[PDB]
Amino acid sequence: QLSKAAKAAAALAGGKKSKKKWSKKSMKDRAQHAVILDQEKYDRILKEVPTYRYVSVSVLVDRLKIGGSLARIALRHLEKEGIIKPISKHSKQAIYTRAT
Amino acid sequence: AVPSVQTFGKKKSATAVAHVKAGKGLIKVNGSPITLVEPEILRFKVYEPLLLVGLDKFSNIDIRVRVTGGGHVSQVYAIRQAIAKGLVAYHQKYVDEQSKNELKKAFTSYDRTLLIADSRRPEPKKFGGKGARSRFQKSYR
Amino acid sequence: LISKKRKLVADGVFYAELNEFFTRELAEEGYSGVEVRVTPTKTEVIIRATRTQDVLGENGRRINELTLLVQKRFKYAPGTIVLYAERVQDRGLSAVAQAESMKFKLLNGLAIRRAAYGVVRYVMESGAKGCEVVVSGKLRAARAKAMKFADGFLIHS
Amino acid sequence: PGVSVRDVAAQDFINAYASFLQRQGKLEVPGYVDIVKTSSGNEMPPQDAEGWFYKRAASVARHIYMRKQVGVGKLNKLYGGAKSRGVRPYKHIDASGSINRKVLQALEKIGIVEISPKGGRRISENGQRDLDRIAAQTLEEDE
Amino acid sequence: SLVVQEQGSFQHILRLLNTNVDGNIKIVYALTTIKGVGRRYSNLVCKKADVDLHKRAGELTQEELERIVQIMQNPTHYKIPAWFLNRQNDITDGKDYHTLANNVESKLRDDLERLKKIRAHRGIRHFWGLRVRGQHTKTTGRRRA
Amino acid sequence: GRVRTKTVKRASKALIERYYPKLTLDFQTNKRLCDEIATIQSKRLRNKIAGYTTHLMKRIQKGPVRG
Amino acid sequence: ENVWFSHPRRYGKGSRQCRVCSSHTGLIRKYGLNICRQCFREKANDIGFNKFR
Amino acid sequence: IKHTLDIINVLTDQNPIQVVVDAITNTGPREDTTRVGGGGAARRQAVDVSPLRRVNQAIALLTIGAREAAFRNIKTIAETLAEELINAAKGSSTSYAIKKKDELERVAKSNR
Amino acid sequence: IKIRITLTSTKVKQLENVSSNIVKNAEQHNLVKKGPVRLPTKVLKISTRKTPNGEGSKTWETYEMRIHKRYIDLEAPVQIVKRITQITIEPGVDVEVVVA
RNA sequence: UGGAUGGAACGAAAAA
RNA sequence: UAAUUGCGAUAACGAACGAGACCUUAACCUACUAAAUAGUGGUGCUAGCAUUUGCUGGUUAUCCACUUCUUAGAGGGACUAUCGGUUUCAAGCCGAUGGAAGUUUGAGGCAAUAACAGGUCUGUGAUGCCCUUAGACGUUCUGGGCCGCACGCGCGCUACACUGACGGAGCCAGCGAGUCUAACCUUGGCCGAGAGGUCUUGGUAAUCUUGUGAAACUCCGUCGUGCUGGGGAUAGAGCAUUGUAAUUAUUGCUCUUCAACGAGGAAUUCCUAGUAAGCGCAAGUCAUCAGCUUGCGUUGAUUACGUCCCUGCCCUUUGUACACACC
Ligand SMILES: [Mg+2]
Ligand SMILES: [Mg+2]
Ligand SMILES: [Mg+2]
Ligand SMILES: [Mg+2]
Ligand SMILES: [Mg+2]
Ligand SMILES: [Mg+2]
Ligand SMILES: [Mg+2]
Ligand SMILES: [Mg+2]
Ligand SMILES: [Mg+2]
Ligand SMILES: [Mg+2]
Ligand SMILES: [Mg+2]
Ligand SMILES: [Mg+2]
Ligand SMILES: [Mg+2]
Ligand SMILES: [Mg+2]
Ligand SMILES: [Mg+2]
Ligand SMILES: [Mg+2]
Ligand SMILES: [Mg+2]
Ligand SMILES: [Mg+2]
Ligand SMILES: [Mg+2]
Ligand SMILES: [Zn+2]
């Protein structure tokens, strides 16, 4: 049986909160992808979406500085005229290839 | 009367009866064509009985199925099992068994469960745990 | 106008109540079970006992008593309920009969070993094929314990 | 060669019939539209908000063409979903009723469905004229 | 399948209702930054403002921002069904309000002091800084501060 | 395992001991006559007995057997 | 007086009891037999309930 | 799988099935360590690897490679898998599987 | 004349005896009958803790009651109607006879 | 016709 | 061998219990008996599309016929069958073929001698002894407490997102429960964004709830690596339901408020196939309340088929200053 003092002391010690973290939590690059397009972007898309063996929403956001929505709307625009063919048009994963 | 047979296929808890009779070569799944087997991935999985033997063996016959119970995956295996067994039953009781020998060997050589139901059955749940084998958790101290 | 489920379980508790009552009533008369038989216009009860003339009583005074008790407490109209008492065959081949005799012998001061071997001998003589009697509790001491008396051979599983 | 609703893909038929109902725009609108959730189980109103009543009518229409009789109870059971009860585990909740009720009344006023004996709604004579002809047009669209 | 280039009228982070809402996100969710304005309220007000939800917040015509604000300050005048409002039957004038950015904490504080002044159980619990909704406190809310 | 208990071994030994000019190397016929010439409470036991009896007469066909 | 048993007993645990031991805890109301579990196990065979699996 | 096969087809125009089977062959660790001894002091000792374990390990290292890489990343798991597969199939020293493969090989040889 | 007889017993053996002799009596009287329909038996289950008190390993025990129910239709004259329900009463089997 | 030693490990109030 | 289960050896011979044997349940039967409270086909009446016969529906007294699917009762079926290896050459073991089924087919139920100073006098109108018994420790009534919080630990539920979130569509189970001196389980119609309200209806039940149109799941979309459209703790305002009575919010619904959490240290739990794991549904308590338990089904992996190293268990030999027995 603990003394009517030791427990109190323990409680006081315990109220040293702040929460043990056992973690590191290193920061990242904090990307700032473009959200609305412009002329100097637009022509960049037009001039270099060819010479790509594969384009996708991810492919046009990891290399280019545009966002996901910009990517999907671009792929929808580009294929309408016809530069890249569709071969699998499932949602959540678009697969398109250069016409040749 | 007209030549006709009827069989069934089964899975975990799904059953699929199959009416087969001489016709003009139509395949129906509860009032619809085979081409609307909702899962967009098992489409070939239910195409398998047709494609293994070739479509020509269907020009003269009609197959219609009714499937209930189970889940989508189990359901599909029910339709395919029903079609396969109805096919062999028809060849058994109207055509000679010469064709049977090749069609049966080709089926079994490609997959067993076309003609033989899967024997795996669910195991009852037991107290002291959330499953048939698992236990909750022991804490000694 | 009751669902068959509750009707059957009602029959279960029906048999239960009578069985428990009788074991609390006809102990000295060698009660050895009861059977219930339902017929149109009558539900019928059969008692299995040894001292049947005692179960009946003088001019059937006791049996009529029991008929009334079960009537009034079960809400039956006259003539719908009847009790017969019948002598049990092979009185030695009845555990409920034996246990009661063991009880009475102990209450009359008979010794443990003599009583138990009296019973196991009686049942063996009565054409049984295996018997065992177990007594537990305070036996001429403060620390409790049990003793087993057995003859022939039995099964357990 | 003859066709029916069951001869066309489920998604396409609904999209076709809803687009059909668009340009006449004479089905109905409850008025409290683009304010409600369609169910207590949902978390956000429909993203479309430019309709989705025509979609609802199309789906319930073919659903009745599928079954024999349907009521609001079955519509709620069908269209409900798994509600996220915050921290407690999820649970099934049937969808809103007033929505499907007004949908059924709208189809009544258009004459696609009617009250049926022994409860529920049945598809109408001229109703199936519409559903089959829409299905036919949808299928021959592939040419 | 449409990609319009732009016009140079786009503006980044802007200010309204004493709140610095972010740009370059969709308007309905941008308004969620407004204190006391949630998802449902923002969605409904923008639909009452006849604004297409798809444009990013920064790309928006200024002349209807004040229209939106006018909506949300007295929503009941614009056929808002009066059960969206977060403060109903309140305590003094009995009519229906909807508190916004700077008023939410003020109405919280004055409610708390009302209960303190009246010495109700809830007010006492708030003063002590404990749970008021009847939860157990034996094993939870340990490092609450 | 596939061990056959003594109530099977002894019973089969009995049948071999006193029913040789009888049941033959076929399991089916021995099954069909085991219940005819003996009393077995359960069919699973009867089948086990007949199976061992056949195994014994298989042993018998290659020389004798001890006991 | 008129307050000796005044409080209602139309529901809750106090409204019902084992028909044998008159306990309030551990009732089995399923199928409307109203017997607590520990009394129930003793009379299970007499009632006709048995173990099979 | 259907998607990642499409990816392996649009890139690297050879047969994707051949691509994956090459990746498996090139990602099976052929030597490994394990605990060996005769009592209180057992040590990391080198041992050869069964072909079945070679395949099973390869399939693992590939799948975990994709799952970790695509985790918390814009790239989809379907294309990330093919990225891992084609890199291992050609031999790149940039795929995760090769990292563990040669790491196990080097540890085994140093601790033979 | 279009009578329903239902059996709702607990014990199969005595149930089958009742079903057997009813159909046998009908056959020997040469009456048109609808064969005995054998409804699926229902199983009554209860699960309780084995221990009276609370301690020990958590062991659970389940009891069952099997009820078997059967029914038959007859087209029969009045004189025979009364005597089927007059005879074939034996315990453990509940019988229900009804018109319409 | 064979072959392995191989780390550390204290204590348990009186009576029945 | 899973087994003092067997082959056998043998100062032992002949026996009994346990295991096994046994019972229930899940798998096979186009074979027996059948079945509007289960179906199927055809025939009538009838709706739509093409028309050339046809395809898909609706229809109780339109009948006729059958039992494959469903339901049971009686039975059959696997006994490791046949073949090839391997061992005194026996009990056995391994592989293949055939087969619905070849780890005692899978899973349970029952389960020996002797014990624990394990738990329960709060289950008992089962109890010995002690205490109290009328300003009672009996019983009853009102209001609080069993939740109370500076802290420690156990079983769990939510999540840390893209193998994702949100919105529309698609659309599938099984185990069960249900009212008589009663208010149960509710279909259908109407009102209401919702919770819910109101007018009717079937069922004492394979027929009615209920095809429990469940969920996870699929298909189109919006989002986009930002403590963000992840996450929903805390808190404010209003509307209902259950209940005499909800105030330290019973629960449900609507709006707003939007905290930790970026995969978790030493340590530690369960598990070999429809099993782990994910997903829901029914029942128990129940006037109302599941984050619990007992069962049920849907989706369905990876990794052994081995060993005594750690923790333990069975048999034999050996040592012992132990016998409440290595604490
Ligand atoms: Mg599970
Ligand atoms: Mg849905
Ligand atoms: Mg989850
Ligand atoms: Mg991803
Ligand atoms: Mg010391
Ligand atoms: Mg010392
Ligand atoms: Mg018809
Ligand atoms: Mg051999
Ligand atoms: Mg077993
Ligand atoms: Mg006790
Ligand atoms: Mg407590
Ligand atoms: Mg526990
Ligand atoms: Mg069902
Ligand atoms: Mg959210
Ligand atoms: Mg409940
Ligand atoms: Mg509990
Ligand atoms: Mg020594
Ligand atoms: Mg000593
Ligand atoms: Mg020591
Ligand atoms: Zn009791």
Both structure tokens of F13: 């030994």
User: Cα angle vertex C56, ends C53, C62, to 5°?
Assistant: 135
Dihedral sign from CA coordinates of G15, G21, G25, G26: negative
Cα–Cα dist B122/B116, whole Å: 18
Contact between E43 and D32 using a beta-carbon 8 Å cutoff: no
Strand residue runs (E) in chain C: 34-39, 42-49, 81-87, 130-137, 145-152
Question: Which DSSP string corresponds to D95-134?
Answer: --HHHHHHHHHHHHHHTSEEE-TTSSEEE-HHHHHHHHHH
Taking the CA of residue C36 and the C1' sugar atom of nucleotide K111, their distance in angstroms comes to 33
How many domains, in total, are found in chain D? Answer: 1
What are the phi and psi torsion angles at C150 (to 5°)? -150, 155
For C91-100, b/e burial (b = at least 16 CB within 10 A) is bbbbebbbeb
How many domains, in total, are found in chain G? Answer: 1
The radius of gyration computed from the CA coordinates of chain H, to the nearest angstrom, equals 16
Interface test with D, best of E47, E80, E133, E135 (most D CBs within 10 A): E47
Q: What is the CATH number of the domain that holds C27?
A: 3.30.300.20
Nucleotides of J under 7 A from a protein CB: 4-8
What are the phi and psi torsion angles at B59 (to 5°)? -60, -25
Assess contact for I60 and I49: CB atoms under 8 A: yes
For residue I72, give Cα distances in angstroms to A65, I11, I75, I83, I94. 81, 18, 10, 16, 14
Q: Is residue C35 within 8 angstroms of chain G, CB to CB?
A: no
For residue C99, the cross-strand partners are none
In this structure, the answer to whether residues C17 and C71 fall within a common structural domain is yes
Count CB pairs under 8 A between chains A and E. 31
Which ligand does the CA of B15 lie closest to? 13
D35 closest CB neighbour out of E39, E44, E53: E44
Taking the CA of residue F38 and the C1' sugar atom of nucleotide K19, their distance in angstroms comes to 25
| Residue at a domain's end among C86, C104, C126 | C86
- Nearby residues of E104 by Cβ (< 8 Å), 6 or more positions away: E35, E36
Cα–Cα dist C31/E51, whole Å: 92
For residue G31, how many other CB atoms are within 10 A of its CB?
A: 16
Assess contact for H57 and H26: CB atoms under 8 A: no
What kind and span of H or E run contains I7? strand I3-7
Q: Which candidate, E2, E3, E11, E5, places its Cα nearest to that of E59?
A: E11
In this structure, the answer to whether residues C70 and C116 fall within a common structural domain is no
Q: Which candidate, C6, E71, D77, places its Cα nearest to that of I65?
A: C6
Reported for H82-87, long-range contacts at CB under 8 A and 24+ positions apart, including other chains, are: H82/H4, H82/H5, H82/H7, H82/H8, H82/H11, H82/H16, H83/H7, H84/H23, H85/H4, H85/H8, H85/H19, H85/H20, H85/H23, H86/H8, H86/H11, H86/H12, H86/H19, H86/H23
For B88-127, b/e burial (b = at least 16 CB within 10 A) is bebbeeeeeeeeeeebbeebeeeeebbeeeeeeeeeeeee
Reported for D58-63, long-range contacts at CB under 8 A and 24+ positions apart, including other chains, are: D58/D13, D58/D14, D58/D17, D58/D18, D58/D21, D59/D14, D60/D100, D60/D103, D60/D104, D60/D107, D61/D17, D61/D107, D61/D112, D61/D113, D61/D123, D61/D127, D61/D131, D62/D5, D62/D13, D62/D14, D62/D17, D62/D131
Both structure tokens of D134: 């829409």
Annotation: binding site of H for Mg(2+): 70, 73, 75
Taking the CA of residue F29 and the C1' sugar atom of nucleotide K7, their distance in angstroms comes to 28
Both structure tokens of E29: 């969710």
Q: Amino acid identity of D68?
A: K
Nearest CA in chain G to C4: G31
Contact between I63 and G38 using a beta-carbon 8 Å cutoff: no
Cα–Cα dist E61/C13, whole Å: 81
Q: Which candidate, B79, B85, B64, B57, places its Cα nearest to that of B20?
A: B64
DSSP state, residue I29? T
For residue H43, the cross-strand partners are H36
Contact between C9 and I91 using a beta-carbon 8 Å cutoff: no
For residue I47, how many other CB atoms are within 10 A of its CB?
A: 12
Taking the CA of residue D72 and the C1' sugar atom of nucleotide K235, their distance in angstroms comes to 37
Cα–Cα dist E116/D22, whole Å: 58
Assess contact for F48 and F54: CB atoms under 8 A: no
Q: What is the CATH number of the domain that holds A85?
A: 1.10.10.10
What are the phi and psi torsion angles at F24 (to 5°)? -115, -170
Give the three-class secondary structure for D77: helix
Which ligand does the CA of B122 lie closest to? 1
Which residue range forms the structural domain that includes residue G36?
1-53
G49 closest CB neighbour out of I49, I50, I64: I64
- Alpha helix locations (H) across chain I? 12-28, 78-86
Assess contact for C36 and C18: CB atoms under 8 A: yes
Chain D contact residues (CB < 8 Å to B): 6-7, 9-10
For this entry, resolution in Å reads 3.2
CATH T-level fold of I1-90:
Alpha-Beta Plaits (3.30.70)
Which residue range forms the structural domain that includes residue A80?
37-99
Cα–Cα dist E25/E21, whole Å: 10
How many domains, in total, are found in chain C? Answer: 2
Cα–Cα dist I54/I61, whole Å: 15
Burial class (CB within 10 angstroms; exposed 0-12, middle 13-18, buried 19+) of D138: buried
In this structure, the answer to whether residues C31 and C62 fall within a common structural domain is yes
Both structure tokens of H70: 């695509």
**C8 neighbourhood in chain I, CB within 8 Å:** 8, 10, 65, 67, 94
Distance from CA of C154 to the nearest CA of G (A): 21
DSSP state, residue G50? B
Instruction: State how beta strands I3-7 and I95-99 pair.
Output: antiparallel
Nucleotides of K under 7 A from a protein CB: 1-3, 5-8, 16-28, 30, 33-37, 40-41, 47-50, 54-59, 61, 68-74, 76-82, 90-93, 100-101, 104, 106-115, 117-126, 140-142, 147-159, 161-180, 186-196, 204-206, 210-227, 229, 231-239, 243-244, 247-250, 252-258, 260-265, 269-281, 283-287, 290-300, 302-304, 309
Which residue range forms the structural domain that includes residue D135?
1-143
DSSP state, residue C88? P
- Nearby residues of G23 by Cβ (< 8 Å), 6 or more positions away: G17, G36, G39
Q: What is the CATH number of the domain that holds G30?
A: 4.10.830.10
Q: Which candidate, D41, D44, D45, D46, places its Cα nearest to that of D86?
A: D41
Cα–Cα dist C97/C28, whole Å: 10
**A38 neighbourhood in chain E, CB within 8 Å:** 5-6
Dihedral sign from CA coordinates of H78, H84, H90, H94: positive
Q: Mind spelling out the 3-state secondary structure of chain F? A: CCCCCHHHHHHHHHHHHHCCCCCCCCHHHHHHHHHHHCCCCCHHHHHHHHHHHHHHHHHHCCCCCCC
Assess contact for I5 and I84: CB atoms under 8 A: yes
**D14 neighbourhood in chain B, CB within 8 Å:** none
Q: Is residue C5 assigned to a domain?
A: no
Dihedral angle, C-alpha E39, E41, E46, E49, nearest 10 °: 180
For residue C23, give Cα distances in angstroms to C99, G37, H37. 11, 22, 72
Interface test with H, best of A95, A96, A100 (most H CBs within 10 A): A95
Which residue range forms the structural domain that includes residue C122?
95-157
**I58 neighbourhood in chain B, CB within 8 Å:** 127-128
All structural domains of chain F, each given as residue ranges with its CATH number in brackets, are 6-61 (1.10.60.20)
CATH second-level architecture of E13-78?
A: Orthogonal Bundle (1.10)
I44 closest CB neighbour out of G31, G37, G40: G31
